Amino acid sequence: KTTGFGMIYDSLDYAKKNEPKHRLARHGLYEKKKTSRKQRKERKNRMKKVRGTAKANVG
Amino acid sequence: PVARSWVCRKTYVTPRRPFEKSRLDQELKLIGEYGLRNKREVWRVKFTLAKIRKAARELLTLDEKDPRRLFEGNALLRRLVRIGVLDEGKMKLDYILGLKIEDFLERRLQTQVFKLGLAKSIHHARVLIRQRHIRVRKQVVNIPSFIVRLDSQKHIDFSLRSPYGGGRPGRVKRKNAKKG
Amino acid sequence: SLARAGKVRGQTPKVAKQEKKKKKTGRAKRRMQYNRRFVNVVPTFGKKKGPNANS
Amino acid sequence: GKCRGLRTARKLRSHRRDQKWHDKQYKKAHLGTALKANPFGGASHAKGIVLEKVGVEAKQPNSAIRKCVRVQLIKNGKKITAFVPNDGCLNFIEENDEVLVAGFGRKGHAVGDIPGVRFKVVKVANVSLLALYKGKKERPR
RNA sequence: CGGGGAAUCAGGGUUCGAUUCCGGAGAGGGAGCCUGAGAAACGGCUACCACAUCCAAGGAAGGCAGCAGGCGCGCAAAUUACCCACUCCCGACCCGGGGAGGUAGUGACGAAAAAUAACAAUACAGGACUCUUUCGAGGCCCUGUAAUUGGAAUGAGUCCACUUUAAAUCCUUUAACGAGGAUCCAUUGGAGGGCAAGUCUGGUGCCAGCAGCCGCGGUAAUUCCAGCUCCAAUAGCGUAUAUUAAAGUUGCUGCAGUUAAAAAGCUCGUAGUUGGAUCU
Numbered sequence: 025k026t027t028g029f030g031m032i033y034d035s036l037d038y039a040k041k042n043e044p045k046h047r048l049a050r051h052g053l054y055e056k057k058k059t060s061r062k063q064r065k066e067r068k069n070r071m072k073k074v075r076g077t078a079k080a081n082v083g
Numbered sequence: 084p085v086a087r088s089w090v091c092r093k094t095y096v097t098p099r100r101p102f103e104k105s106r107l108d109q110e111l112k113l114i115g116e117y118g119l120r121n122k123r124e125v126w127r128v129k130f131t132l133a134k135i136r137k138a139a140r141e142l143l144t145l146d147e148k149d150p151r152r153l154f155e156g157n158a159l160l161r162r163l164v165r166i167g168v169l170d171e172g173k174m175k176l177d178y179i180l181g182l183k184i185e186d187f188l189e190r191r192l193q194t195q196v197f198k199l200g201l202a203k204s205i206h207h208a209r210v211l212i213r214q215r216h217i218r219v220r221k222q223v224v225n226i227p228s229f230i231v232r233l234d235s236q237k238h239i240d241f242s243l244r245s246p247y248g249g250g251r252p253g254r255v256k257r258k259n260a261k262k263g
Numbered sequence: 264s265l266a267r268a269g270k271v272r273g274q275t276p277k278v279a280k281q282e283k284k285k286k287k288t289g290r291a292k293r294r295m296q297y298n299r300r301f302v303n304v305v306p307t308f309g310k311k312k313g314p315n316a317n318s
Numbered sequence: 319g320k321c322r323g324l325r326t327a328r329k330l331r332s333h334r335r336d337q338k339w340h341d342k343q344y345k346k347a348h349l350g351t352a353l354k355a356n357p358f359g360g361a362s363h364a365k366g367i368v369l370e371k372v373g374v375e376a377k378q379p380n381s382a383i384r385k386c387v388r389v390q391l392i393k394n395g396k397k398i399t400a401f402v403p404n405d406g407c408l409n410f411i412e413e414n415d416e417v418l419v420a421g422f423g424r425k426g427h428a429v430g431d432i433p434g435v436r437f438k439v440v441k442v443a444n445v446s447l448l449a450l451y452k453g454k455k456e457r458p459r
Numbered sequence: 460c461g462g463g464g465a466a467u468c469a470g471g472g473u474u475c476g477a478u479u480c481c482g483g484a485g486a487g488g489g490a491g492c493c494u495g496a497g498a499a500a501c502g503g504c505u506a507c508c509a510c511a512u513c514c515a516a517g518g519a520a521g522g523c524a525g526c527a528g529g530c531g532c533g534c535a536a537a538u539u540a541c542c543c544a545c546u547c548c549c550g551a552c553c554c555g556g557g558g559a560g561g562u563a564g565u566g567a568c569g570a571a572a573a574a575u576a577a578c579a580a581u582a583c584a585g586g587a588c589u590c591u592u593u594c595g596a597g598g599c600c601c602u603g604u605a606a607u608u609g610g611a612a613u614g615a616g617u618c619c620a621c622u623u624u625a626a627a628u629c630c631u632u633u634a635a636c637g638a639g640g641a642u643c644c645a646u647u648g649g650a651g652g653g654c655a656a657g658u659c660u661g662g663u664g665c666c667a668g669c670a671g672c673c674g675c676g677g678u679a680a681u682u683c684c685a686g687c688u689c690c691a692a693u694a695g696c697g698u699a700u701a702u703u704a705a706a707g708u709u710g711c712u713g714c715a716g717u718u719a720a721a722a723a724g725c726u727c728g729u730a731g732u733u734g735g736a737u738c739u
Binding site: 111112118119209 | 289290291293294296297298300301302
Binding site: 334 | 532665676677683700702708711
């Protein structure tokens with residue numbers, strides 16, 4: 025035997041609203057960002073160092 | 084803090100005296116009779132039996148109409164009957180103290196495979212179980228220390244995927260038949 | 264005075280170990296120990312011989 | 319004899335601790351003067367620097383020279399004598415060498431023929447004397 | 460730091476508890492505050508004390524007993540990895556964030572399971588059943604030596620794929636390859652006694668050394684150094700140290716005090732301990 029879990033939704037709209045994004049990405053219905061954690065942590069700190077509309081310039 | 088459990092036991096005790104000839108001979112006789120790997124399997128069965136007898140001896144100190152004594156005693160008696168060590172007629176708390184290590188060693192999967200004629204030796208039985216040729220009811224069991232329940236003994240089979248079972252002969256026969 | 268170090272170990276002639284067949288391990292070794300001590304037993308009137316007894 | 323009254327608890331426990339102080343192993347463990355006289359300082363092992371090589375003469379019935387070493391421990395600066403067990407193993411030791419030392423087995427008591435040695439050399443230049451003696455490893459310098 | 464608890468243990472006990480749960484304390488040391496419902500808060504501020512960074516020499520900025528990591532210290536302890544998918548928490552919030560936590564890496568701390576081969580035929584060898592006065596004659600099993608043969612079953616590994624998962628890895632499931640002893644070769648200690656197993660052979664000659672203890676070694680060494688053989692445990696086994704049982708050698712259970720260690724020179728006496736019957 026192989027034992028797993030399964031779900032059948034009523035429509036694709038409810039499936040998109042109620043599945044986790046990773047089980048939607050296994051069917052090609054989601055695209056994850058390619059940025060890692062450390063890049064956006066360091067970007068967040070770097071733009072924490074600056075003030076105002078100049079925050080959007082750094083990156 | 085982590086989401087991990089740290090509960091673990093030791094399943095045997097090392098004996099008090101290291102070199103006593105009577106104990107060495109008796110343990111080697113057990114190993115030869117039942118085809119065991121080392122002294123630790125003998126010590127493990129001995130420790131299990133000692134735990135059972137300590138539990139029964141703790142139960143016998145209470146009054147005969149005590150609720151804990153009755154409940155735990157029938158639980159222990161049913162557990163020892165189900166593995167086939169006790170019998171239905173002698174299902175009493177006093178008979179538990181009359182149990183042997185050789186009583187528990189007959190209930191291993193190795194011994195039961197050897198007794199039912201599936202194997203021609205006790206060492207051959209241990210090999211056959213380890214080689215994934217033996218199934219119990221429907222599950223393939225790879226462990227020789229598998230204690231066979233009384234209702235589970237009547238159907239021990241050859242695990243149809245095995246060469247001795249349904250089909251698909253193994254590596255050696257496929258190589259030798261593909262010579263010419 | 265005196266106090267040599269490694270005198271005898273450096274004196275003793277080097278004898279090479281002979282190449283022998285390997286020993287069985289695990290359950291097979293215990294099987295061989297059981298079959299040697301309890302199965303093919305030779306009766307003895309007083310049993311004064313050990314396993315490593317020579318001469 | 320002993321007091322056996324129902325109210326003699328503090329007499330019993332006070333006399334117990336007072337006569338407990340008369341036990342030699344208890345006084346070694348709990349007075350705290352042996353722990354500060356111990357060079358290892360409550361450690362299984364210590365690491366030191368070889369100061370010199372010593373021939374220690376064996377006690378009266380046995381005639382031998384045991385090869386020992388005077389070492390100064392790194393962590394407290396105390397000086398000890400450690401025995402180098404096997405034959406030819408003193409030749410693996412040079413002066414001003416880094417050496418791991420353990421006790422010899424009788425808990426601070428001298429052992430066998432050797433007068434006044436409580437310690438043995440375990441490792442020389444961070445490689446074991448066993449691997450050097452059996453020739454499994456090589457020693458740096 | 461204290462508890463929950465842990466090791467050991469007949470019964471009584473002894474020892475441990477920095478350590479993931481509950482409580483407390485503190486963020487280099489002291490001290491004083493602001494904000495706030497809540498802090499005498501330190502990934503807030505202000506000082507002094509001790510350290511220490513950038514300087515253009517005027518000034519400016521500090522606080523890993525958080526996560527990784529480094530130095531130092533030592534007998535003594537892991538990656539400057541990936542994710543917020545799970546568990547939950549915070550926010551104006553179904554949406555954002557979390558080195559909390561999760562997942563991998565290192566990991567013989569410790570615990571559980573468990574390989575290193577099994578079988579068949581022959582040649583010797585035993586022990587049994589039948590027939591024989593016996594010798595013997597057989598078809599009944601067993602055992603290793605097999606410098607004897609034989610094919611069968613395999614997991615280790617190699618490695619498509621599926622499954623796992625946030626993405627992976629691992630485990631599991633599976634194609635294909637993968638086993639005859641010079642291999643896919645099991646170690647660590649020991650062999651006088653305690654304590655299981657050699658008065659074997661060679662070398663050394665109170666030397667080198669072994670030896671927890673008793674002892675061995677000074678020319679037949681059962682103890683050193685080796686070879687062979689044997690013994691114990693076995694993927695494990697030594698050694699050092701702390702501790703527990705052995706220890707009825709701390710004795711409440713349960714020890715002693717003539718001669719072995721030990722009762723005060725003697726009496727009085729307070730606290731302490733103990734205290735005669737007797738009431739339906």
